[PDB]
Every structure is written in C-alpha cells, then in structure tokens.
Amino acid sequence: RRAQKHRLRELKIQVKEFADKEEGGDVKAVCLTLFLLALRARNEHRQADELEAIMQGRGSGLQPAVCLAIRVNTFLSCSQYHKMYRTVKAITGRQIFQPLHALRNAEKVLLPGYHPFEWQPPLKNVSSRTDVGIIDGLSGLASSVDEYPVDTIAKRFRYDSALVSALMDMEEDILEGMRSQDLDDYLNGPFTVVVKESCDGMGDVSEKHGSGPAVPEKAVRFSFTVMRITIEHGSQNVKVFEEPKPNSELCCKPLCLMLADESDHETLTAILSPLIAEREAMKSSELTLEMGGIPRTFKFIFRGTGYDEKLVREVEGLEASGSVYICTLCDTTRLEASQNLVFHSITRSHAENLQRYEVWRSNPYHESVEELRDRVKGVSAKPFIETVPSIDALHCDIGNAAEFYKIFQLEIGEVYKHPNASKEERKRWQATLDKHLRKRMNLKPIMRMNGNFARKLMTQETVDAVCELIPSEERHEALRELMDLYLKMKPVWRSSCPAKECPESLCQYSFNSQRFAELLSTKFKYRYEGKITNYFHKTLAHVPEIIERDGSIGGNQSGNKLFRRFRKMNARQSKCYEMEDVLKHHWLYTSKYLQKFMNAHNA
Amino acid sequence: RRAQKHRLRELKIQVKEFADKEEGGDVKAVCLTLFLLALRARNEHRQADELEAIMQGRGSGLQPAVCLAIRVNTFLSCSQYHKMYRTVKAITGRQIFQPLHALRNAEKVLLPGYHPFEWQPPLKNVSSRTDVGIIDGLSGLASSVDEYPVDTIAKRFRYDSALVSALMDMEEDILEGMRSQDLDDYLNGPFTVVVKESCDGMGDVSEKHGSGPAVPEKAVRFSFTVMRITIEHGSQNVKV
Ligand SMILES: [Ca+2]
Ligand SMILES: [Zn+2]
C-alpha cells in the first residue's frame, strides 16, 4: 500500500481535487460511484449487487444483535465465543462475527435504563433519574448486627425502567401491528397496556455432588408479562397487539430475584413492598415515549392473576388450608359447599378485606373468638397485595376425575345397601377395579394422580366397561348422563377462547350444572359426607363469572432448570455479582427482539 | 446511473488516459487500489478487507473439519450447534456452516479404524480386519453370575488402529519436516518411532445429587504418546 500510494499519489490528488471542486470534499462517495461503474463496464453485475450489499452491510455482516441472540440462546461463555470469533476470522480472512466490546454495546442498548422518557404526572416517591439498571433488591436494608438479621440476596430492577425497556423492545412489533390493523404509522396515544402479574418460587437450586446434604437453598422470582395492547380512534377501540402464548417461558420478564423461602413472610414482604409502592404510584400516571420518531402516551392496567393457591392464601391474609373457608371468591364454608353447589357469587375484594382486617383488629362488639372467626370469614392478616385470582384447566379436570374415581369405587361397592363397610373391603373393591381396568383398558394404575391418567380415564368406553360390572342399569344411565354433562362442560374451560370457540356450550352452563347438581344431590346422595374440594367448588360455582370477567382459563420444572443452567454456565462468584449476572442474562433471554431474530428459519 | 455517468464522463476519460499512460489500459487494478487506499484512510478497514476477500475470490463457506474442530474445542452439543447452523443459514441466505451429516462423515474419516494398512509379519493372535474401532475393553469377559463378578465398564480401541490413525494425522507434520530437512517426498522407511505410555486414575468422576455422597467412583484412562519420529538413511539418522 505504501508503494501503491507512491504510484497513485498524483491520481489521488486529482480525484480529491475534483471532489472538493464539485461536491466539496466527498472523496469517499465519488470513489464508491467511480469504482462501481468501473466494475459495471465489465458486466459483472453479481459483484455490483454484492458491493451494494456490503456497503449496505446486509450481506455477510452479522449485525451484533443477531450474534448476541445466538450467544444468549446457545449458552456460550465469553472465552469460547472469543475463540470461535478469532478462529473463523483467521480461517476466512473476513470478519463474519463481531468482537466482544460491540457485543457489550449491543447488550447495553437492550438493558433497562437506556432510553429517555418522562411522565405527565411527576410520579411521587420515585427518583426521576433515568439511567438506573440493576439495583440492589433490598432498597437499602439494615444489614448491621444490632438489627434483625437477614441473609438473603436480592437483585431487582426499577419497575418503570423495565416497563420502558420492554416497550422499546416490542416497538417494531407494535409498529407493524398498527400498520396491519389499517391505521397510520403516525398516531399519538394513549396506548393502554394490560399487563399480567405473577410470582413463583422455584424450589431448590443447590448442586452438591457430595459432602452430605449441603443446603436446601430456596429461592423465588417476581416477574411480569405484557399481555395485550389496545388503542382507540375516536370512540372505536382496537386490539392493536395480542400475545399468542401467555404462560410460556419466553415472555416472562423478571423484575426481581431473591434467594429466600416462599413462606418466610417478613423478608418476602420487606423486599416486595417498594415494587408495590412503585406500582401504585404508576397506576394513576401517564408515560411519554419517543419510539416511532414521534411521542406517544401510555396508561396502564395491572391484573395480578399469575399466583398459585398457597401463595394467594398467604399474601392476601387468608387461612392457609385447614379452615372451613375454601373459596377465594365466595365466603362459602365447607359445610355449605357440600350443601349448596352453585348458587353463589363473587364477594371478595381488596378494600373490604382491609376493612375486615380492621374489624379484626378493633373488635368493636367485644364478641368471642369463634364468632369473630366466622364474622370475618377467615381474615387474619393485614392484606398488602391486590390480586384477582383465577384457575387453570388441569386442576379442574383433575378434581373432577379425583371425584369420579371415588364414585366408581362406591359404585362397585353397592354401598347404597351396605351403609358401612370395612376399609379393606373398599381396598379390595379398588383392587378389583384396578384388575378390571387393566384387563379391559390396559391401563397401569398408580396412587398418585396426574393430568395424564385423569385425562385418559374420561372416555365413554371406560365408563361403559365399569358400568357393565354393576347391575340395575338405571345406574348406567345415571353415569351416562353424568359423563355427558362432564364432556359437555369440558371444552368450555378447555378452549382458551370460549366466547368464540364454543359459545353454544358456554350457554346452557348454569342449566347443565344445575342438572348435574340435581343428579348428585338426589341420585348419588351418598357422597354427602361434608368432604368437598375447593377445586370442585370453583368448577361448580365460579366458572361463568370468571369467564365474563376475562374470557380465558389461560410447566413446573421450567424456571428452575433454566435458573440452574444460568447459574452453572455463565456466572461470577462471591454471591454479589452472581445474581446480577443471572438476572441480566434472564432479561436478555426473555427479549422479543432476540427471539424474533432467532426463529427466522420458519420464514 | 446515466446521470452520474454524465457527471463523471470527464473523470472516466481522465483516469482512462492515466490508465493507458501509467500501466497501459489497467483501469481495474488502479481503480481497485484507489478504492482500497481511500477506504483504508477512512479507518473502517472491515469493509476494506471484506472487499479484498470478495474480489480476490476467498470462499465464504468453509471445510467441515474446521466446524468439527471448533465444535469439539468449545464443547457444544449437536442440538445447539444445529440451532446455530440453521440460524446463520436463515440470516445469511447463503450457507457457510455445515449440517451434521458431513460432520459425522469427516469424523469417521478422522476416527481410527478406517484406513487400510498392512504388516509384513503376520502378527500372531491379532485379527486381520482393518475396520474395527471402538470395542469392549472386557475382551469377552463373561460376567455371568456363576463366575467372578465385576461391574467395571471398559471401552478400548485396537492399538495398531490408534497407531496408524495417529500416523495418518501427523502425516502432514512429517511431510513438512521431510521437506524442511533437505529431503524428498518419495522416500521409503523404515521410520523408527519412539512411543511412551501412561495410565493414571483420576479419583472421583461422579456428580451424585439424589442423596449426596453415594460412592467414590474411581476411573482410569490408559493412553499412549508419540514423542519422536526418525529415519536413518545412508550413514546417519535425522529427527524428522
Ligand atoms: Ca494420581
Ligand atoms: Zn365460591
């Protein structure tokens, strides 16, 4: 290049002097065009569009977000990716991948705390500094010796910044969504965003090959998911964005992680309370953003539905499990639940629960303990988290089949004429049923019940096989009608869109459930022993109100295995940088941008 | 195109004159090196050597063996590799990496038990097949319950297979050494090879998590190592 510079210096002076005498110092672009047409005179057009692509960079360039998605999805550490990059860079001569600092900039553009924004109300008790990332989850606790001891490790994001980064991630999708729904690319807000709210612990995360049992080491995440986005034009609203898979593992963006027990109450609420404060400050605010070159405004709505049963009974203030109070919507006792089957409503709310707890504190009528216990309907603790509860179809049909197995046990028992039996007589009845189902169905019995055995039990042919063993075929007709009502009721909560999929089955729901209640209360009037499952109470009573409220009934070892993967593969030690690392890599794993690049094979 | 051609017709005819007067109708290399010098003075050299590789004729895709090398050296599973391969194929359009078929093909090429060879002695108590690799280390130890009971799993090669495979992939090294130390390629042997051997146990190799410490399971590899290849020609020998 030095001797080429010596042979080409005069020509270089001439081309730069034409550049500054025609364009004004634009030697690069004119050099591009003259070399391009110098190749175009030899009709090698493949190389011409190739040079267009490499000046475009969209050829074999690999924009750093793509290889970042590759490294995150394939679980590569830094040294190995550096090895792969330098080896392919050496063997091809061209630099097809990217180096590490560009990868760090490409990940710094996707973390929380990068884009600017503001809020039309000034967001009381929130620091308006706009470049905060992973902060300490303890919000400045009091870890000194003279204080209450707490040895947990919690790392969190601020709520608003993570919401902002999630919206900036789904920016391109919401652009093409509002294009596809026959509207303009220019449109001010307000976009109203409905957000799923969830929390769950992932059990044990310890890995000890020996040294006895090491540590139980329970931990728990707190996460959210953007469910749907909507917008009006004048008075007509439109769903501008809907999510296809709500409960999947690729759309659960985490706020905070802590290594703590799920039931360790005070530490849990002490870490989770400032995020609650941020949520309630955010409930009555207005976000303003600059995504599509123009400002947009945002309101928000939060649905706390992603909780499980033991946790919602714990963090709202109810009894754990051993009460007479089983319904988290209706105040029906266990006594009345066996008695009244469907005629209830939804009567539990947050503010009245606060009022009931204040009644439990004050005790204004100086009554005794048990009448307080039935007056407040199981309210014992101060409520501190708003939560709208729901169900899932696995618990519904597993409670159904757990009833039905006992129904067939009493049906082979002929217990209507044997008012008592020995327990081992019922064990022999059960064992004859087991031999019977193995000899007819070829089914393998098991004491534990999962969704699989429960789902493959409910067939017309198996209920035919079990009613063929019993005489008095009015019993066969009774279980036939009963199974018919069951299979009618099944795809209602087994559709995920029952307002649209099976509206005929959605209608006549109170009609068929009242029929089935009349069947169980009159014909099979021997199950009435007071034993009733809360799952069954929810399937009988609390179905259609949940349906008209939401419209849906929409993987245990999922977060924990992935958490062990992140902790073991790519992590720093000392228990301080570790949680920041797994939190950051989890947030990078959960981006819509990277997954959208990652599954490009289907196109 | 015709507009900028009209704008730069003087430039085209000017460097046309300069190409005829400097190197005699050599517009291609002159205009190319002008682009290279300009875009390297731009200090954005990734585009520059990309254009250099594409105008030299450097191939985009690569050998299967290099994919095998980087896969082994990074310790990656076939699932994640296949995901990476299909993503780069979907993004780039053209294919650069390889799928698993040619990988396993070049693998069994490089594996022992594939290439023919012979022995001038007949090698008593040794089989005649040249195409057996991995076998049981038990050598037909009947482990029925009526006999002495063991449980030690043992896998092994055949020794001569390992020797000939080690020779065939050090073949390029000994070729370069023969070209370095003043000889030809058309030499015959007998090449004298010095081989040391070793085995050592490694202590526990187990990750027991069902209940903690189950068994200190001790394993042991047995291995060989070449360290010297020589040839004696005429009077003396030479460490090739
Ligand atoms: Ca040793
Ligand atoms: Zn209820």
From Swiss-Prot, chain B:
Residues that coordinate or bind a divalent metal cation: 200
DNA-binding interval(s): 1-56
GO molecular function: endonuclease activity; histone binding; identical protein binding; metal ion binding; protein homodimerization activity; sequence-specific DNA binding; ubiquitin protein ligase activity; ubiquitin-protein transferase activity
UniProt effect for mutating residue 6 to A: Allows robust hairpin activity
Knockout consequences: Mice display a severe combined immunodeficiency phenotype. The have a small lymphoid organs that do not contain mature B and T-lymphocytes. The arrest of B- and T-cell differentiation occurs at an early stage and correlates with the inability to perform V(D)J recombination. The frequency of homologous immunoglobulin pairing is much lower. No obvious neuroanatomical or behavioral abnormalities have been observed.
Effect of residue 5 to A: Reduced hairpin activity
Keyword DNA-binding: yes
Domain of life, source organism: Eukaryota
Posttranslational modification: Autoubiquitinated in the presence of CDC34/UBCH3.
GO BP annotations listed: adaptive immune response; B cell differentiation; chromatin organization; DNA recombination; negative regulation of T cell apoptotic process; negative regulation of thymocyte apoptotic process; positive regulation of T cell differentiation; pre-B cell allelic exclusion
Expression across tissues: Maturing lymphoid cells and central nervous system.
Impact when changing residue 45 to A: Impairs DNA-binding
Result for mutant: residue 2 to A: Defects in converting nicked products to hairpins
UniProt GO cellular component terms: nucleoplasm; nucleus
Family affiliation: Belongs to the RAG1 family.
Function: Catalytic component of the RAG complex, a multiprotein complex that mediates the DNA cleavage phase during V(D)J recombination. V(D)J recombination assembles a diverse repertoire of immunoglobulin and T-cell receptor genes in developing B and T-lymphocytes through rearrangement of different V (variable), in some cases D (diversity), and J (joining) gene segments. In the RAG complex, RAG1 mediates the DNA-binding to the conserved recombination signal sequences (RSS) and catalyzes the DNA cleavage activities by introducing a double-strand break between the RSS and the adjacent coding segment.
Domain comment in the entry: The RING-type zinc finger mediates the E3 ubiquitin-protein ligase activity.
Protein name as it appears in the record: V(D)J recombination-activating protein 1
Origin species: Mus musculus
Complete-protein stretch covered: 401 to 640 of 1040
